[PDB]
Amino acid sequence: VLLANCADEPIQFPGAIQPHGLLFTLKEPELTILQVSANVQSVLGKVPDQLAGQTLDCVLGAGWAEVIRSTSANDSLVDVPRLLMSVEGVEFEALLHRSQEALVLELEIQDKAAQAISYSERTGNMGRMLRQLHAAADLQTLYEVSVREIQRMTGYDRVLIYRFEEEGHGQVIAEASAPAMELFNGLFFPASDIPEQARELYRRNWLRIIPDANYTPVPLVPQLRPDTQQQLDLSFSTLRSVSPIHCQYMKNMGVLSSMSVSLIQGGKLWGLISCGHRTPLYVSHELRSACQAIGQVLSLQISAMEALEVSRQRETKIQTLQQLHQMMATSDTDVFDGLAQQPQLLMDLVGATGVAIIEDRQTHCYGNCPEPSDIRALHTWMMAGGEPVYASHHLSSVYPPGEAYQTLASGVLAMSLPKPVDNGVIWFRPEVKQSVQWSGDPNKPLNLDRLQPRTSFEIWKVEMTGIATKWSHGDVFAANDLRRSALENDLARQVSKEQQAVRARDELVAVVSHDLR
Amino acid sequence: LLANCADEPIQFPGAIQPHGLLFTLKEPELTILQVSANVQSVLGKVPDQLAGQTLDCVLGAGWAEVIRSTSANDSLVDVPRLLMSVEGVEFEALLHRSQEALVLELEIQDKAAQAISYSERTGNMGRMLRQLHAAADLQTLYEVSVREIQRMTGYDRVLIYRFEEEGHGQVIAEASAPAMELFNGLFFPASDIPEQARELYRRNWLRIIPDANYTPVPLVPQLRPDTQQQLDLSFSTLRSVSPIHCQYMKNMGVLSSMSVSLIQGGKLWGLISCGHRTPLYVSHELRSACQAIGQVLSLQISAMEALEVSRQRETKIQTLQQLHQMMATSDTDVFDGLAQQPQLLMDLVGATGVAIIEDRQTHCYGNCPEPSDIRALHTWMMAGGEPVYASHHLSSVYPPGEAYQTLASGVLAMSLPKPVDNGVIWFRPEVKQSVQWSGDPNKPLNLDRLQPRTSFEIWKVEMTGIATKWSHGDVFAANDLRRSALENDLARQVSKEQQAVRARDELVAVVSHDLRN
Numbered sequence A: 001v002l003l004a005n006c007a008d009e010p011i012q013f014p015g016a017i018q019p020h021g022l023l024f025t026l027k028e029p030e031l032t033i034l035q036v037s038a039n040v041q042s043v044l045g046k047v048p049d050q051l052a053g054q055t056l057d058c059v060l061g062a063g064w065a066e067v068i069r070s071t072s073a074n075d076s077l078v079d080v081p082r083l084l085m086s087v088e089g090v091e092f093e094a095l096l097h098r099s100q101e102a103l104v105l106e107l108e109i110q111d112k113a114a115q116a117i118s119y120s121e122r123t124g125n126m127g128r129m130l131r132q133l134h135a136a137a138d139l140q141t142l143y144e145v146s147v148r149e150i151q152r153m154t155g156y157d158r159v160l161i162y163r164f165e166e167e168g169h170g171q172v173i174a175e176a177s178a179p180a181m182e183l184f185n186g187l188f189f190p191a192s193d194i195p196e197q198a199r200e201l202y203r204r205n206w207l208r209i210i211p212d213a214n215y216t217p218v219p220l221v222p223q224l225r226p227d228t229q230q231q232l233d234l235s236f237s238t239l240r241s242v243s244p245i246h247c248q249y250m251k252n253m254g255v256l257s258s259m260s261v262s263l264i265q266g267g268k269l270w271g272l273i274s275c276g277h278r279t280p281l282y283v284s285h286e287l288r289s290a291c292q293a294i295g296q297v298l299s300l301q302i303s304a305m306e307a308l309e310v311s312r313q314r315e316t317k318i319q320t321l322q323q324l325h326q327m328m329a330t331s332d333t334d335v336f337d338g339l340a341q342q343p344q345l346l347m348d349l350v351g352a353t354g355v356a357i358i359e360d361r362q363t364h365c366y367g368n369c370p371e372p373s374d375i376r377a378l379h380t381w382m383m384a385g386g387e388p389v390y391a392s393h394h395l396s397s398v399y400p401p402g403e404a405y406q407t408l409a410s411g412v413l414a415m416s417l418p419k420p421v422d423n424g425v426i427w428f429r430p431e432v433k434q435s436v437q438w439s440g441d442p443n444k445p446l447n448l449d450r451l452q453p454r455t456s457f458e459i460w461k462v463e464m465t466g467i468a469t470k471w472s473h474g475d476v477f478a479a480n481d482l483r484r485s486a487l488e489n490d491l492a493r494q495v496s497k498e499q500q501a502v503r504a505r506d507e508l509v510a511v512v513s514h515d516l517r
Numbered sequence B: 001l002l003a004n005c006a007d008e009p010i011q012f013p014g015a016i017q018p019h020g021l022l023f024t025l026k027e028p029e030l031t032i033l034q035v036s037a038n039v040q041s042v043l044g045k046v047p048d049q050l051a052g053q054t055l056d057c058v059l060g061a062g063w064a065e066v067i068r069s070t071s072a073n074d075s076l077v078d079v080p081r082l083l084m085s086v087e088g089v090e091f092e093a094l095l096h097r098s099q100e101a102l103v104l105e106l107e108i109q110d111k112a113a114q115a116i117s118y119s120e121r122t123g124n125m126g127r128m129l130r131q132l133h134a135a136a137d138l139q140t141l142y143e144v145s146v147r148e149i150q151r152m153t154g155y156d157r158v159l160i161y162r163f164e165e166e167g168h169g170q171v172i173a174e175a176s177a178p179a180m181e182l183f184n185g186l187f188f189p190a191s192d193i194p195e196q197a198r199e200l201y202r203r204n205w206l207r208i209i210p211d212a213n214y215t216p217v218p219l220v221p222q223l224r225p226d227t228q229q230q231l232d233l234s235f236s237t238l239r240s241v242s243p244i245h246c247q248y249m250k251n252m253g254v255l256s257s258m259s260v261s262l263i264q265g266g267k268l269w270g271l272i273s274c275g276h277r278t279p280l281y282v283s284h285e286l287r288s289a290c291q292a293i294g295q296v297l298s299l300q301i302s303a304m305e306a307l308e309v310s311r312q313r314e315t316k317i318q319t320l321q322q323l324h325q326m327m328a329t330s331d332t333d334v335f336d337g338l339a340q341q342p343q344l345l346m347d348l349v350g351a352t353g354v355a356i357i358e359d360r361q362t363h364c365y366g367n368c369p370e371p372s373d374i375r376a377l378h379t380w381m382m383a384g385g386e387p388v389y390a391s392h393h394l395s396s397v398y399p400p401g402e403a404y405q406t407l408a409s410g411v412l413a414m415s416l417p418k419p420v421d422n423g424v425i426w427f428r429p430e431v432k433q434s435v436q437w438s439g440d441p442n443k444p445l446n447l448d449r450l451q452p453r454t455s456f457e458i459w460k461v462e463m464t465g466i467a468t469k470w471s472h473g474d475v476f477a478a479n480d481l482r483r484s485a486l487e488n489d490l491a492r493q494v495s496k497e498q499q500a501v502r503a504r505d506e507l508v509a510v511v512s513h514d515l516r517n
């Protein structure tokens, strides 16, 4: 309840924009201003209250307004080129999109430092960087070169690859930090850092930048758009004010600038390319788009190399799978009995230290095996789910009665044939004591007060018990292939046995005729 | 005589193209082992006297020292740009190793090449990657890719030539200059790119031929004074091409070529071919950028192929599930219950004929061939041993399939892994397709030494006996139907066997009763 309040704020409708830019939501045909950020009282010296129901020619000039009108006319606003303007002597980069039948235009203010930065030198290493990405033979080298290039172009002190887990919390796997700067490599972070609302927003918007954490938000006047009397939806607006709790969180970490690129794999937020600077500094949108493209290439290569690793595991298990299939096919006994004829091969097929083969009230145990009654209770629990195969690296997390034998069997890989007879094969992996590193208190994710982010950011050890070694993709693949081979061989055996009985029946028909003479 | 097209030793031409200089040297002291004869015109050095001499004699002390530092203890896979001004003519240096020797190639940069800069032509690189990831169609992907490649290279014609299984390839993307012949959709004979060329290009992913009228400049000494063999210019961009290919390019009307190998899983998926009506040289930086574009193209092709396969999977999931529910609650034979609704089985794969074989009864629905012919086909199909089979041209692999090619030209067969003869076959009728070929398919070359064909006109070839291609979703549906049939059949045979061996034992008891009398 109170924890769930972390995921209830309407971040999509903040009503304010960051001071590093200007916002203009306008009517499409005549480019009449619907709302304008209050920052125009300082920038360009225009009163935002009178700038209602007025064309862009009043403030932005005739030529630039005509250029914007030409660009936005009969265009999907997905391939708009660069737009740099000098408006009363201050330069803006213009980005255009549409929220609800209205044209939202953001002018990112380019400072002198941004002007000094050029797109040529920082993207000079583009082709070689992609060559390095394709030439990397390890995931760690991939991460290293990616964060190295991203730090090279951005210039930020710390760059992190923060991969999300299923439950919401994430882990940092790549780190590139400046000297005399705190390291977060390998640290886990609570799921409360990025709420569900933030993940949902970032699944669509793949680029966020916060140049400063001490900024005072500049409200949008009029607050309600005079078209539907609602709040402007700044979901895809780079000029969106962030929640003050996040600003306090960044201040507590000690960083004053952030820049994150969403990594998307199959429409899901796989991770974030987080960045951190000890001092405020702004990054131009062109460099942000280049970093976004680097992130998309990174996601593509991650998927490619994950498939490559899965295929490598399949290849290294093909020989053992073939040997086991040949042993099962030419056993003339029950399928699981012939499988159990060679226990060591079955063990090394999955790399587990315990094997339990169940066949209709007989259980055979090899290696480190629990009490047979406990395994029977577990198996009768496992068939309730109905899944053909099951892999669990933490049985006690999902199976409450698994705490008694967590020292012997903390990882369970089970596969069963689709027949009424209770049969199956279970592989048990023992618990490994792992001291998971967390950034702060795992049992106190949030300082409950308005919510306040935790000040402490030190590394905490958590000796997580009852968790065994992760089952690899090749492991479950081998389990499924063994299940498929058992399915095929068992079907062959039953059809042949019926045929032999049928042939014996035909032989018996010959015998009955012989028994009649 | 046709096979002579794939016998020339292209890897050892003994000559280099005149647009550059080659230096193969011993690694430690950078002493020249052999040098191309082109040095008689460029830099004005006699190639005969340039034996057993350090690079300092011709290339200068500073440039020799930089090359020595770069090549020392380096894999030559991340070498930065190397531009030198040697007696007033500019060279770009590339370094690699063929056989325990350092091969260094100086590509000559003309004034036109010097004027061209890597910045402007690659300014839209990040936008190009954004367009690649944002494209929702394969045709859009190809279009934007060839558009960018034509933009940087400036060549008149750009083609995406995808290879087929048999060796011949087809052009799927075309970007041609005005008043220039179009090859969109045209098939090309496999003799255009022999097996040797494909094998060489599987390793070297970048080839450029600026001119077709060039006279090769021989390498002196021809044999290295280390192993008395020919230098292996496999990864050398300065390699002379076969004169037959030069004549082929002249016959096509192009005088410049530039190809990037597309690699998918270690296989030559296709080539990004290019064509210019006049000689023109492309700098190595733009070639490397095009290579990176090609690798990204291959990655996105694989990604979108997986996406299309998954879309087909989703659209067939409902039909597969409905058939599974109908099959599970039939209490009859598995294929009989499947055949209870023939139209649904037909629309599962989109075929016009269904043949279900169950123990000497064959049931035909829709456009079905002669039952004897289908039985012969089925007994031929089990010989291969594949669990599933898809063929879009049965007469190509089944000689007796020509009689019914009008009715069944596409066969999708799936059988259970049991000795008992059972199975499901889907038949697709022949569609008359006029395949377009560039020239004579039966006469690739005008045999007179092999000579490339002069004619490059579009030829219609009415290929009969070919049905519609079976999609990836089609074979996916076949395998899932096979899996569901496997599970249900195993359940049914296990149940019948449970209540079957009892009768056999009873018969034995009956026999025992009939024996004790």
Ligand SMILES: *C/C=C1/C(=C/c2[nH]c(/C=C3[NH+]=C(/C=C4\NC(=O)C(C=C)=C4C)C(C)=C\3CCC(=O)O)c(CCC(=O)O)c2C)NC(=O)[C@H]1C
Binding pocket: A005, A006, A007, A009, A011, A160, A162, A172, A184, A189, A192, A193, A194, A195, A198, A208, A209, A210, A241, A242, A243, A245, A246, A249, A258, A259, A260, A272, A274, A275, A276, A446, A451, A452, A453, A454
């Ligand atoms: C219960 C509420 C909390 C809260 C909410 C919150 N946080 C964000 C934004 C972000 N938080 C991030 C977390 C990290 N930054 C890092 O550097 C690391 C690791 C080293 C982590 C785990 C990130 C990356 C974001 C996105 C913004 C960015 O930094 O680029 C939001 C979203 C706000 C918005 O988008 O307007 C919200 C609502 N965070 C907490 O920690 C608690 C107090």
Ligand SMILES: *C/C=C1/C(=C/c2[nH]c(/C=C3[NH+]=C(/C=C4\NC(=O)C(C=C)=C4C)C(C)=C\3CCC(=O)O)c(CCC(=O)O)c2C)NC(=O)[C@H]1C
Binding pocket: B004, B005, B006, B010, B159, B161, B183, B188, B191, B192, B193, B194, B197, B207, B208, B209, B240, B241, B242, B244, B245, B248, B257, B258, B259, B271, B273, B274, B275, B445, B450, B451, B452, B453
């Ligand atoms: C029997 C011998 C033949 C011969 C041999 C041959 N051809 C090449 C090189 C290439 N041929 C290519 C074919 C095409 N170019 C196009 O523009 C199109 C389509 C519009 C096609 C099908 C290509 C792309 C190459 C690679 C070179 C390039 O253009 O970049 C070789 C290889 C030579 C070498 O690498 O040294 C050889 C041995 N070609 C024939 O047509 C017959 C006569």
